[PDB]
PDB file of C-alpha atoms and ligand atoms in Angstrom:
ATOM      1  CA  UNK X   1       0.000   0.000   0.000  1.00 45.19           C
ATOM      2  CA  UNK X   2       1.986   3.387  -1.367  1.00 46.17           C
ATOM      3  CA  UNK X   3      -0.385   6.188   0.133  1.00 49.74           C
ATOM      4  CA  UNK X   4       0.233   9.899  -1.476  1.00 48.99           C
ATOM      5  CA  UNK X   5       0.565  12.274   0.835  1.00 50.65           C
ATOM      6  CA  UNK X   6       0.512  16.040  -0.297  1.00 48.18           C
ATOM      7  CA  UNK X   7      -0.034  19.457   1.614  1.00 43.90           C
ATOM      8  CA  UNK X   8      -2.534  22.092   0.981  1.00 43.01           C
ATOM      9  CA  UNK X   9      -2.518  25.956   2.596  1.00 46.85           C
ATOM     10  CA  UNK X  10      -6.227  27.328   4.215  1.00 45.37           C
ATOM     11  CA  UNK X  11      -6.361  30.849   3.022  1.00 44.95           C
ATOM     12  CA  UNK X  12     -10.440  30.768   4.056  1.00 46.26           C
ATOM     13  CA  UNK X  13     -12.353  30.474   6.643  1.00 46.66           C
ATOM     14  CA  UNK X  14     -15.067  28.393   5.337  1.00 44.52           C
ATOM     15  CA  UNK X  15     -13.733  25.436   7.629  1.00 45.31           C
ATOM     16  CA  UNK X  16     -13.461  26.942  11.048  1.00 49.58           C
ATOM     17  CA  UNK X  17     -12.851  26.122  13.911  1.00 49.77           C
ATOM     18  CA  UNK X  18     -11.818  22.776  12.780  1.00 47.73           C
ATOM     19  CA  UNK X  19      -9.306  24.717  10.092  1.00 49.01           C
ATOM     20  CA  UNK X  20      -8.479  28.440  10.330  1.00 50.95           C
ATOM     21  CA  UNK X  21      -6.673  31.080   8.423  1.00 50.89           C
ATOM     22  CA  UNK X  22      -2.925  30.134   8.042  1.00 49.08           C
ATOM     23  CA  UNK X  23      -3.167  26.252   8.905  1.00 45.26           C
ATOM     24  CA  UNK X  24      -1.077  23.843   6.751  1.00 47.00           C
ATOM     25  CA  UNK X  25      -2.736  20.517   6.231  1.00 53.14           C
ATOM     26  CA  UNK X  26      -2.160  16.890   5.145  1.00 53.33           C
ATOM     27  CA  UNK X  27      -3.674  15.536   2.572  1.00 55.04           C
ATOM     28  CA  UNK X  28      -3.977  11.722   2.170  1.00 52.20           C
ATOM     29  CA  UNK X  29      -4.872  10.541  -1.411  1.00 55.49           C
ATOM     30  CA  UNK X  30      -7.715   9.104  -2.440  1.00 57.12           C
ATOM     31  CA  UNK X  31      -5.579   6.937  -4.941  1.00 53.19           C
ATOM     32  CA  UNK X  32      -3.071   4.190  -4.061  1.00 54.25           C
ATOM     33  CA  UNK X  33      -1.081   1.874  -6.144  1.00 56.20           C
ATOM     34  CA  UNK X  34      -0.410  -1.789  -4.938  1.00 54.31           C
ATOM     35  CA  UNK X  35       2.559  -3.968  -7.259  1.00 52.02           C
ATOM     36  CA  UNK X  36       2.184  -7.659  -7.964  1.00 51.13           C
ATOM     37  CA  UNK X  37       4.477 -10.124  -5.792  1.00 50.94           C
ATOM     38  CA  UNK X  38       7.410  -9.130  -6.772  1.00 54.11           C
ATOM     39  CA  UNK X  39       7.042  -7.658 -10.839  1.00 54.35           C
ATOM     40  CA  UNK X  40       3.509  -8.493 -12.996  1.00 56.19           C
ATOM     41  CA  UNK X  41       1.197  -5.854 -12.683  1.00 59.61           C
ATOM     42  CA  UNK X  42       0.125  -2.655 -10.362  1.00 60.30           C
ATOM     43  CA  UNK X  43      -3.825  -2.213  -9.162  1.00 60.87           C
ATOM     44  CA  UNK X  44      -4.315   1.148  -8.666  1.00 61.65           C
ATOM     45  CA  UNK X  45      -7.543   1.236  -5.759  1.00 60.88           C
ATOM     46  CA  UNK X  46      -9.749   4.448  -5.074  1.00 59.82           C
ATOM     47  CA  UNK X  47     -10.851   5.058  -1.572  1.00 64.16           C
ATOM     48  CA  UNK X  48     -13.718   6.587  -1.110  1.00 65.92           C
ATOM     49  CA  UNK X  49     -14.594   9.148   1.743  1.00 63.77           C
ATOM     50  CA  UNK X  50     -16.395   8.191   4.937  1.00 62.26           C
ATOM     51  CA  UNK X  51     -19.371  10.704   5.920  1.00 62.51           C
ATOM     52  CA  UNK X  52     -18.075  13.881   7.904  1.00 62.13           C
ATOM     53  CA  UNK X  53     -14.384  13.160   6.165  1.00 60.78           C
ATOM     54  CA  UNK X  54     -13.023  16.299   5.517  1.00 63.71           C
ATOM     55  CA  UNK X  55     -11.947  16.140   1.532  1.00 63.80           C
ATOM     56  CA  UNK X  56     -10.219  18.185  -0.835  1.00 66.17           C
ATOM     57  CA  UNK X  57     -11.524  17.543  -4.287  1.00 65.18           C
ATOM     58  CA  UNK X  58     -10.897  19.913  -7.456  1.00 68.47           C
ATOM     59  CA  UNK X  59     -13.688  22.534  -7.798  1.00 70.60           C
ATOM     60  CA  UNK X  60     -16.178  21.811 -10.113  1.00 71.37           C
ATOM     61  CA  UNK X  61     -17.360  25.268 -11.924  1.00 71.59           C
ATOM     62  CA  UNK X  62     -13.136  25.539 -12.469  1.00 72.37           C
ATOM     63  CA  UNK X  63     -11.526  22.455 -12.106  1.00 70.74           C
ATOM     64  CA  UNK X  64      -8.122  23.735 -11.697  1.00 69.85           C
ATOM     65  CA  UNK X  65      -8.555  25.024  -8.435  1.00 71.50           C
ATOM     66  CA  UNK X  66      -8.628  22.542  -5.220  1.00 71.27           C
ATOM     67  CA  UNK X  67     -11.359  23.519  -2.547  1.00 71.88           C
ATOM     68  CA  UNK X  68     -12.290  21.771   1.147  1.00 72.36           C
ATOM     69  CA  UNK X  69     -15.381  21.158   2.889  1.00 73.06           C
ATOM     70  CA  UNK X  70     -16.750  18.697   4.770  1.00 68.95           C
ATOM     71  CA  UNK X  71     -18.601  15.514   3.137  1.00 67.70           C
ATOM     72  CA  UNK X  72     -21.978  15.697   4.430  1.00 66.64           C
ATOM     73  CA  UNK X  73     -23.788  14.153   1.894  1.00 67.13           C
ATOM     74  CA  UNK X  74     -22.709  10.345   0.382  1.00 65.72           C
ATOM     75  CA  UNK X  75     -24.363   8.631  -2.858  1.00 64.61           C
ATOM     76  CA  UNK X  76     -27.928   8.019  -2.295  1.00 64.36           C
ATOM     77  CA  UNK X  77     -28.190  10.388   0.631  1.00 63.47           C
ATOM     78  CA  UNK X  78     -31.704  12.631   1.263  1.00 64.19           C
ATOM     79  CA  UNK X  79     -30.036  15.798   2.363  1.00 62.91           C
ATOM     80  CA  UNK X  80     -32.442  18.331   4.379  1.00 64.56           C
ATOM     81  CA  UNK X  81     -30.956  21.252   5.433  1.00 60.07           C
ATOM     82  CA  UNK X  82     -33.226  23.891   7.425  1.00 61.23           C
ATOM     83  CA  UNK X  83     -31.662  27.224   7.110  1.00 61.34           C
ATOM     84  CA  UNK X  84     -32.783  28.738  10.154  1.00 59.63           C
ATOM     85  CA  UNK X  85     -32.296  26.644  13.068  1.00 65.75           C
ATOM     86  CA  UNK X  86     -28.939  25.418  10.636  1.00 64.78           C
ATOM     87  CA  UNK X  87     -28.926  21.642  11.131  1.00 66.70           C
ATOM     88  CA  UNK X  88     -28.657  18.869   8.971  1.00 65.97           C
ATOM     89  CA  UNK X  89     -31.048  15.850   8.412  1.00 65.76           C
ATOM     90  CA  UNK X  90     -29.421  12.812   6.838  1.00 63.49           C
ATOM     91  CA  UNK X  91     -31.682   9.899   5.457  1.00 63.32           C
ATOM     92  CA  UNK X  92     -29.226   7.640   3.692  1.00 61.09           C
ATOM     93  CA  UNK X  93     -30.175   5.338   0.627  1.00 60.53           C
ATOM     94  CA  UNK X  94     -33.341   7.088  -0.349  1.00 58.76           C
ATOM     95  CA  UNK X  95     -32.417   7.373  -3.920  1.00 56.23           C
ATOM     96  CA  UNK X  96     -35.911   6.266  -4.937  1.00 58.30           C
ATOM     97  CA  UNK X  97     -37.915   9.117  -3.287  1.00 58.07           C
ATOM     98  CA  UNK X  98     -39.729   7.339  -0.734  1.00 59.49           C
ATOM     99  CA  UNK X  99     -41.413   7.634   2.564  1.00 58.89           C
ATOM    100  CA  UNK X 100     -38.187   5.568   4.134  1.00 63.73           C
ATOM    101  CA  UNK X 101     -37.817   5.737   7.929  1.00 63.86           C
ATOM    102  CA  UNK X 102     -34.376   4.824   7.948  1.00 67.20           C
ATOM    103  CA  UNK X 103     -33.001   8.125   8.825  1.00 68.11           C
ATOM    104  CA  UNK X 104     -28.710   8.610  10.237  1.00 64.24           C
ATOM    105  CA  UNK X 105     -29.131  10.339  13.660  1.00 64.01           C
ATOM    106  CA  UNK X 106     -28.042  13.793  13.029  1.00 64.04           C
ATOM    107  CA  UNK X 107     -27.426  15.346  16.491  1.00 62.72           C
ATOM    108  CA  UNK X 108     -26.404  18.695  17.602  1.00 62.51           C
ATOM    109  CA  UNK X 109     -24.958  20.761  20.999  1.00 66.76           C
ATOM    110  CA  UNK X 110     -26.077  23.123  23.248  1.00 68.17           C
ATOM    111  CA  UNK X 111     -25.156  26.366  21.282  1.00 67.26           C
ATOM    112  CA  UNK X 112     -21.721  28.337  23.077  1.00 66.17           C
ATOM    113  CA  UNK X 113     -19.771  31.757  21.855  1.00 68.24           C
ATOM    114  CA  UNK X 114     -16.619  30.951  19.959  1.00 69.31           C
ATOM    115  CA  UNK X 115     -12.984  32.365  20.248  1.00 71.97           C
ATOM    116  CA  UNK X 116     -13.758  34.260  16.651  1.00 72.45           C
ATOM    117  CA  UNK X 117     -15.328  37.220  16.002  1.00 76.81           C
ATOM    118  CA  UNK X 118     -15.926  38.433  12.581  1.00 79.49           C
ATOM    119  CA  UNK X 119     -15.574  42.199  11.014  1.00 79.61           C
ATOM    120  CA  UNK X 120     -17.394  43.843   8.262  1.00 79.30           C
ATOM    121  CA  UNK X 121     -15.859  46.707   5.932  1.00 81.01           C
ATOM    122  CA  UNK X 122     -18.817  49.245   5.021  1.00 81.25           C
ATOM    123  CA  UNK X 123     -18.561  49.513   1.637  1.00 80.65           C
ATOM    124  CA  UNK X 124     -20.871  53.179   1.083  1.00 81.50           C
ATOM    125  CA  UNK X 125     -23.791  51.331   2.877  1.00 79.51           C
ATOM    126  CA  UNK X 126     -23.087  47.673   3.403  1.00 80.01           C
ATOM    127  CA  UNK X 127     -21.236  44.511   5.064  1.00 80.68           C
ATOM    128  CA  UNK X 128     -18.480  42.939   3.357  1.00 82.46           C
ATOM    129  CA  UNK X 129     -15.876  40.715   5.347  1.00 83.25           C
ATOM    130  CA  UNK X 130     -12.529  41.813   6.134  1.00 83.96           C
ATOM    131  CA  UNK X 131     -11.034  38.890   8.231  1.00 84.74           C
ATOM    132  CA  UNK X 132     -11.798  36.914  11.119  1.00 81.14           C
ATOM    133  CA  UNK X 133     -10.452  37.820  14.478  1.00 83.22           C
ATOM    134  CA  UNK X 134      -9.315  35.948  17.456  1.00 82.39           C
ATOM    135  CA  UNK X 135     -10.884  37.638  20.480  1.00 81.19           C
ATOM    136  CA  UNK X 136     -10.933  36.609  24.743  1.00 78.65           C
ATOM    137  CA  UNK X 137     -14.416  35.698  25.308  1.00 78.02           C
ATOM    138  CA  UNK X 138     -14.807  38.345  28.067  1.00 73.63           C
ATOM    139  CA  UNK X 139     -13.847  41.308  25.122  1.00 73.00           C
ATOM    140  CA  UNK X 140     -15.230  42.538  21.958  1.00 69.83           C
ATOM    141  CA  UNK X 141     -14.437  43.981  18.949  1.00 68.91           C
ATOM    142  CA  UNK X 142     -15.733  47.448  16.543  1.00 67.93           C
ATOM    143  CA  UNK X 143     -17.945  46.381  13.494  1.00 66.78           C
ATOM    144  CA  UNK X 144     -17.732  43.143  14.399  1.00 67.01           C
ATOM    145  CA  UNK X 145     -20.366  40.441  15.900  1.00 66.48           C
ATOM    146  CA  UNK X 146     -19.498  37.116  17.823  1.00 67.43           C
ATOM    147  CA  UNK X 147     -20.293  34.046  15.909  1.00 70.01           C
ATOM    148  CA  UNK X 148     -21.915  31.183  18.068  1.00 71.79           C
ATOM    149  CA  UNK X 149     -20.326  27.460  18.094  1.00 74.80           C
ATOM    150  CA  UNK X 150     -22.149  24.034  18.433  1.00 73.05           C
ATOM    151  CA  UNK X 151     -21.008  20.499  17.650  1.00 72.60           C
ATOM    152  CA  UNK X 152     -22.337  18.449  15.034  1.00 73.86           C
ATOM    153  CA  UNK X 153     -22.818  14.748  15.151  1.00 73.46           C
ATOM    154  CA  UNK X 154     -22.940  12.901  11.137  1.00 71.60           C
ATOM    155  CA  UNK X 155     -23.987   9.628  12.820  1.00 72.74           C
ATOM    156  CA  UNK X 156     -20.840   8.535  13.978  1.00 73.86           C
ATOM    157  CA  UNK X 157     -18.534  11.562  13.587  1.00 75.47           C
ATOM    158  CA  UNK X 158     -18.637  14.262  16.173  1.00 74.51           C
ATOM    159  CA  UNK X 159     -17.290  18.324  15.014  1.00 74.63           C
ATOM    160  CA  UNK X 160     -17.849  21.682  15.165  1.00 71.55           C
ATOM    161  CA  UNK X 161     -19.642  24.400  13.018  1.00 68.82           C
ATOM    162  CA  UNK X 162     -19.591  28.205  13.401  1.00 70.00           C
ATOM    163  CA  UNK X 163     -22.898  30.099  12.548  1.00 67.53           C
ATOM    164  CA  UNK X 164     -23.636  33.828  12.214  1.00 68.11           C
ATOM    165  CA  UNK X 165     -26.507  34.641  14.604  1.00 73.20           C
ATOM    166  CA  UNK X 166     -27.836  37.816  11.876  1.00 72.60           C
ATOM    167  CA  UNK X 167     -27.017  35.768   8.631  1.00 71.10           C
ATOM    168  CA  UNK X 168     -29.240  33.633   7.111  1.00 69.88           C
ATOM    169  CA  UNK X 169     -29.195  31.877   3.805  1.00 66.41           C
ATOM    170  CA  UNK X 170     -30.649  33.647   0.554  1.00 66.06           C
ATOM    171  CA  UNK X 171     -32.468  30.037  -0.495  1.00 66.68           C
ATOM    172  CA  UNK X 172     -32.822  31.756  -3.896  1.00 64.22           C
ATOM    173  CA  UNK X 173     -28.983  31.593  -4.373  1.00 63.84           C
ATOM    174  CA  UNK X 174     -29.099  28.084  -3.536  1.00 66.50           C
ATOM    175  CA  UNK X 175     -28.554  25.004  -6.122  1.00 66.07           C
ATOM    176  CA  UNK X 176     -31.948  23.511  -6.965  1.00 65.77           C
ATOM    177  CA  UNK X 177     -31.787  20.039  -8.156  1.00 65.14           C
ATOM    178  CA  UNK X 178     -34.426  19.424 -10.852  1.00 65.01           C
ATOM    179  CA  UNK X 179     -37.520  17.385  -9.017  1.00 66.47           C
ATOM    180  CA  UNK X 180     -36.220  18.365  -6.281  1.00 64.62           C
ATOM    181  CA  UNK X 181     -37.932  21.168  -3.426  1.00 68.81           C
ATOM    182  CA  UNK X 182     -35.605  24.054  -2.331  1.00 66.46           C
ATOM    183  CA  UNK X 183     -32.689  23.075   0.889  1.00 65.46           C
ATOM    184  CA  UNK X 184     -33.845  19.208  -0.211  1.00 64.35           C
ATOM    185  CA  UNK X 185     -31.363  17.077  -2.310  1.00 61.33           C
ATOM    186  CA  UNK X 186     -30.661  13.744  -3.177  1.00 62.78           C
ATOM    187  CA  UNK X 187     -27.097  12.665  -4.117  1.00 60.99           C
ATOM    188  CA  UNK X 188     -26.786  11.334  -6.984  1.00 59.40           C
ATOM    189  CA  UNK X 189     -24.799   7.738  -7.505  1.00 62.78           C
ATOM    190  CA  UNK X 190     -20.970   9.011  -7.681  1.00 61.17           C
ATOM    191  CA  UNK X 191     -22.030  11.953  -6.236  1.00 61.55           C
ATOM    192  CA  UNK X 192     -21.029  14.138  -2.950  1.00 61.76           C
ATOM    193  CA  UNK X 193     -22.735  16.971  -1.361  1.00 62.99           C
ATOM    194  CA  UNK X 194     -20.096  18.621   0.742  1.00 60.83           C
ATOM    195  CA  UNK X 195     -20.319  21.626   3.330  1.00 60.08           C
ATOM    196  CA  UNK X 196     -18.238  24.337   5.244  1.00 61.75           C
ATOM    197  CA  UNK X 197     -17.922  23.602   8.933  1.00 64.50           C
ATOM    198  CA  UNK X 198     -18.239  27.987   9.138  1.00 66.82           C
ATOM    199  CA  UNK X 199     -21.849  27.478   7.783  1.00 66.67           C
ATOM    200  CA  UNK X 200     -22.555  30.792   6.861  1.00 66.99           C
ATOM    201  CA  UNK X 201     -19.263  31.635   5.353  1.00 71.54           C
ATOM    202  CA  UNK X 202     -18.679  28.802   2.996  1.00 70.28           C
ATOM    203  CA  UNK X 203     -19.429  28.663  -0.820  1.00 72.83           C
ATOM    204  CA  UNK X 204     -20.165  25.275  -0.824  1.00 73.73           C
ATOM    205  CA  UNK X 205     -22.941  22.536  -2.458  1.00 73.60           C
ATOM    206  CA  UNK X 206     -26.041  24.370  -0.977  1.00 71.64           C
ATOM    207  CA  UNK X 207     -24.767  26.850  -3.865  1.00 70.23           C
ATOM    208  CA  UNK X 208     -22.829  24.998  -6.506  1.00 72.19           C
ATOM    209  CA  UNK X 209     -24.088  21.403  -6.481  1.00 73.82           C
ATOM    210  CA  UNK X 210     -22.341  17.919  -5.687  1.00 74.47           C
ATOM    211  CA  UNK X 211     -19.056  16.315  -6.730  1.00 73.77           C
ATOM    212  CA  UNK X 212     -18.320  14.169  -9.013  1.00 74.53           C
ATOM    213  CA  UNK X 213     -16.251  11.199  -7.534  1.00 72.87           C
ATOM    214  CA  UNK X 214     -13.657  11.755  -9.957  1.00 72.09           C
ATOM    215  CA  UNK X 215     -13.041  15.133  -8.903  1.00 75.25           C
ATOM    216  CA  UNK X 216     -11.954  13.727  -5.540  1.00 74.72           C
ATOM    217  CA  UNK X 217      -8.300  14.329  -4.177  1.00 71.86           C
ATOM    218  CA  UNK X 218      -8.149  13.219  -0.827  1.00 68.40           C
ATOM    219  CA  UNK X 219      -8.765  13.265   3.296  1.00 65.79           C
ATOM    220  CA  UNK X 220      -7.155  16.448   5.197  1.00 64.75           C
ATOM    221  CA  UNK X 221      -5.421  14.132   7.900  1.00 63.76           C
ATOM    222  CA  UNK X 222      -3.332  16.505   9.991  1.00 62.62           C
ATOM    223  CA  UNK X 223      -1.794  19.712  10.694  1.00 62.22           C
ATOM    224  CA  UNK X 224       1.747  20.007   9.727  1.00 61.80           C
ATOM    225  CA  UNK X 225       2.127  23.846  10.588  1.00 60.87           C
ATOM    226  CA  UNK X 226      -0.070  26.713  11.716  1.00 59.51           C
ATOM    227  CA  UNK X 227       1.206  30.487  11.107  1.00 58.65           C
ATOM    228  CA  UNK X 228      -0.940  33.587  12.392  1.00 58.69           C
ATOM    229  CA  UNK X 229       3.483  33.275  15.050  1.00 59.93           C
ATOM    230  CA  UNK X 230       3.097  29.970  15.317  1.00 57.23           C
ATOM    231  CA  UNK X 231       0.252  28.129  16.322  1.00 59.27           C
ATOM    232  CA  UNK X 232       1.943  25.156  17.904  1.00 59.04           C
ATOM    233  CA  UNK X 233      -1.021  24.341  19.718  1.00 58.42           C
ATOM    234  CA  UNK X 234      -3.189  23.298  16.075  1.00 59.71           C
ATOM    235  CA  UNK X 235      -0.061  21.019  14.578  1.00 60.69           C
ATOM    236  CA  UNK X 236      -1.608  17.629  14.896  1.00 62.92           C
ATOM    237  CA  UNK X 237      -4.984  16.010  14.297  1.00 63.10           C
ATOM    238  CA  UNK X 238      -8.201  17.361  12.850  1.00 65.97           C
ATOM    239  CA  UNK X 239     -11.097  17.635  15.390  1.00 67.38           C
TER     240      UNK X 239
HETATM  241  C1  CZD P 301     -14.626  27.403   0.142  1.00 67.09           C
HETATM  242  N1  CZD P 301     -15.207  28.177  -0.464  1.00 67.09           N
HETATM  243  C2  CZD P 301     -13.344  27.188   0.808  1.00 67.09           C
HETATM  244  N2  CZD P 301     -12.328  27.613  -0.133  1.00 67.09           N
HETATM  245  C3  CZD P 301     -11.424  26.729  -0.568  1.00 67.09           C
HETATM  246  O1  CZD P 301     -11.507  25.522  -0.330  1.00 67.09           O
HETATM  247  C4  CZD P 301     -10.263  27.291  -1.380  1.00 67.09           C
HETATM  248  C5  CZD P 301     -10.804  27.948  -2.659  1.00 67.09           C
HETATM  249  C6  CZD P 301      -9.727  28.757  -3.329  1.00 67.09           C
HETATM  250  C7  CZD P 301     -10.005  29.581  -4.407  1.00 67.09           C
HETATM  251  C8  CZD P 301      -9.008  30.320  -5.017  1.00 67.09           C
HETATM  252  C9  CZD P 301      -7.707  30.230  -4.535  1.00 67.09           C
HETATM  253  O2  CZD P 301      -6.665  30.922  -5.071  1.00 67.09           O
HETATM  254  C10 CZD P 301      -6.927  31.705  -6.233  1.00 67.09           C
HETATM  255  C11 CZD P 301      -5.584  32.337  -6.572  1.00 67.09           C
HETATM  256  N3  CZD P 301      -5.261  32.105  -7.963  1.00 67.09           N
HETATM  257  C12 CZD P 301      -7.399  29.409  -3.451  1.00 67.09           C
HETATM  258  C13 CZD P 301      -8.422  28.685  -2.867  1.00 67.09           C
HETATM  259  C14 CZD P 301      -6.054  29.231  -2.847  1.00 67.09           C
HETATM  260  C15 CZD P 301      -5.672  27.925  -2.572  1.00 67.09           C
HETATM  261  C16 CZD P 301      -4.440  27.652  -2.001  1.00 67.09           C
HETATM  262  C17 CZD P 301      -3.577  28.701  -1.712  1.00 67.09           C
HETATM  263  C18 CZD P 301      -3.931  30.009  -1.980  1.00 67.09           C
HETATM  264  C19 CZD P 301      -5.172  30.262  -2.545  1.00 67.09           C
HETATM  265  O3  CZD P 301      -5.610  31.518  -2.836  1.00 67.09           O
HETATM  266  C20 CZD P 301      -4.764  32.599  -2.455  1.00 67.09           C
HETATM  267  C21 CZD P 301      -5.491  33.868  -2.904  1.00 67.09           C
HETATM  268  N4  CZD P 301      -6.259  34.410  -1.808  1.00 67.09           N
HETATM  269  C22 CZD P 301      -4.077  26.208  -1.721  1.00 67.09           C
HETATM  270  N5  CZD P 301      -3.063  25.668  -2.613  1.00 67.09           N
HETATM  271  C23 CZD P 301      -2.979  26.169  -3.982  1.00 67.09           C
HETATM  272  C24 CZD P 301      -2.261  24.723  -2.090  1.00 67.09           C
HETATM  273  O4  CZD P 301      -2.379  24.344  -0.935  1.00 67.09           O
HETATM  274  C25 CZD P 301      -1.182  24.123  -2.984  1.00 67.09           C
HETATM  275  C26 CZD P 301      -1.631  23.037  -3.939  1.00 67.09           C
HETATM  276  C27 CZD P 301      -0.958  22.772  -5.268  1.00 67.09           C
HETATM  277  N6  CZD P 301      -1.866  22.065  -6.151  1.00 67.09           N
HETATM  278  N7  CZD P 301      -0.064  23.652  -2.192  1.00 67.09           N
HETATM  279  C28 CZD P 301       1.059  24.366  -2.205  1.00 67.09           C
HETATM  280  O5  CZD P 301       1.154  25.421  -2.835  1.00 67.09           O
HETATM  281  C29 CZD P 301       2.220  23.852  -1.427  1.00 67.09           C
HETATM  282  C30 CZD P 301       3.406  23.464  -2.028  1.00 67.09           C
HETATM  283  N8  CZD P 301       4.458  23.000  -1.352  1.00 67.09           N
HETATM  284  C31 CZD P 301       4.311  22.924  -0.022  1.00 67.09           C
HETATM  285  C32 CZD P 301       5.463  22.417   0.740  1.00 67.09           C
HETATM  286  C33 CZD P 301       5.417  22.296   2.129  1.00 67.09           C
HETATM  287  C34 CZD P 301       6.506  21.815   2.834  1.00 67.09           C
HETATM  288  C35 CZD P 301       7.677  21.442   2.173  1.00 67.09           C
HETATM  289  C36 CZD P 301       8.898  20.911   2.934  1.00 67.09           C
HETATM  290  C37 CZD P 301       9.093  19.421   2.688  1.00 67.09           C
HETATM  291  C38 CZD P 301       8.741  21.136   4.432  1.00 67.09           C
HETATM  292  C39 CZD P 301      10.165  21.630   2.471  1.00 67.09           C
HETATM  293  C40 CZD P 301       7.721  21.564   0.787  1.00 67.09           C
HETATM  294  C41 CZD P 301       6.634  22.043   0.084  1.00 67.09           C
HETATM  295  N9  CZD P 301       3.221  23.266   0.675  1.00 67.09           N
HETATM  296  C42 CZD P 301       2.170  23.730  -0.017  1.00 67.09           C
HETATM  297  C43 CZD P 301       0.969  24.096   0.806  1.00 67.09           C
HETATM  298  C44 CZD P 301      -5.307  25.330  -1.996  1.00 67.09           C
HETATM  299  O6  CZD P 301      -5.527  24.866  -3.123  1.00 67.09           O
HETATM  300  N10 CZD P 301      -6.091  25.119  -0.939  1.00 67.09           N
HETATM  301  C45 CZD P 301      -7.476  24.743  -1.139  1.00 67.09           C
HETATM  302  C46 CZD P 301      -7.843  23.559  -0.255  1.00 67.09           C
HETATM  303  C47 CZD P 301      -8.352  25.937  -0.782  1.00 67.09           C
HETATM  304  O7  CZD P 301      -8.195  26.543   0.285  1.00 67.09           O
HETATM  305  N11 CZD P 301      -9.278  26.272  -1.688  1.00 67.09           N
END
């Protein structure tokens, strides 16, 4: 087993906390070659992500840029996604379109205040982001408003998700697959429907659509560095 191991630099924040501004990750290929017993032949195998993975995969309005987000949504997935109390409802292989009770327990937190606060540059008469800021719980910060933290459990994996308590999602901005109602989708086979952990900052599948399994690159499995100084305390796993 000859694993591929490549890394990638976060210059968003559409996967915080769990990846910030300035963290350096690991990213294990999706693709691994195996050689015969000694010299025959070489099967190349293609992993495929777990739900709540968190994969890079090459964008698919442009494929030559590389994007991350979290996959949410697997082939064959029902994906429900109520913008206003922001959760997730995952009923997994209802392909058909049928009243299937068969639903992946989709549980969340008591909501917290996170260590980020988030500015807004007033463009003549608006709110446009300028960064996200690290700020003690106990202070505050000038054009800027606290964003709220909760975990998320995808049935077996357990994270957390950052949420703007005045944004809300323009539904009419939002992907609508054909047959489909609006915030409902069902994956496709070879299909992923993948999300930002920074759920109101992320340009993600609610918007652009799922991913073809071909555009897949790989599972973020560590970080390798962290620069703000260093951030010593994020080198090593992703929780
Ligand atoms: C959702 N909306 C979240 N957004 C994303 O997911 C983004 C989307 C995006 C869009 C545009 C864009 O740039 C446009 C500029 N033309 C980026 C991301 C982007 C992406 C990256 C960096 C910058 C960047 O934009 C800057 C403009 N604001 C990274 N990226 C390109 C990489 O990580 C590359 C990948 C190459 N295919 N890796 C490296 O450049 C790289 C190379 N070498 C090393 C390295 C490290 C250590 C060593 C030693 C052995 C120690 C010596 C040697 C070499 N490291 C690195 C990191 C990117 O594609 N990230 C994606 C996930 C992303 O953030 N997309």
């Amino acid at each position: 087993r000859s694993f591929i191991y490549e890394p990638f630099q976060i210059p968003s924040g559409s996967m915080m906390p769990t990846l910030l501004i300035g963290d350096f990750i690991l990213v294990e290929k999706f693709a691994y070659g195996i050689k015969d017993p000694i010299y025959q032949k070489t099967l190349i195998e293609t992993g495929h992500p777990k739900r709540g993975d968190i994969v890079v995969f090459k964008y698919p309005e442009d494929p030559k840029l590389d994007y991350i987000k979290r996959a949410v949504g697997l082939p064959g997935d029902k994906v429900t996604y109520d913008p206003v109390s922001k959760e997730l409802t995952i009923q997994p292989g209802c392909s058909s379109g049928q009243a299937c009770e068969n639903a992946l327990p989709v549980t969340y937190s008591n909501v917290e205040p996170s260590d980020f606060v988030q500015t807004f540059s007033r463009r003549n008469g608006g709110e446009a982001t300028s960064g996200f800021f690290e700020v003690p719980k106990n202070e505050t910060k000038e054009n800027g408003i606290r964003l709220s933290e909760r975990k998320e459990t995808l049935g077996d994996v357990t994270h957390r998700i950052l949420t703007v308590p005045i944004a809300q999602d323009q539904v009419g901005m939002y992907y609508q697959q054909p047959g489909q109602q609006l915030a409902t989708w069902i994956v496709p086979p070879g299909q992923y429907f993948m999300m930002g952990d920074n759920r109101d900052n992320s340009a993600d599948s609610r918007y652009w659509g799922f991913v073809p399994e071909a555009n897949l690159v790989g599972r973020a499995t560590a970080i390798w560095m962290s620069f703000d100084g260093l951030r010593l305390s994020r080198i090593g796993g992703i929780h």
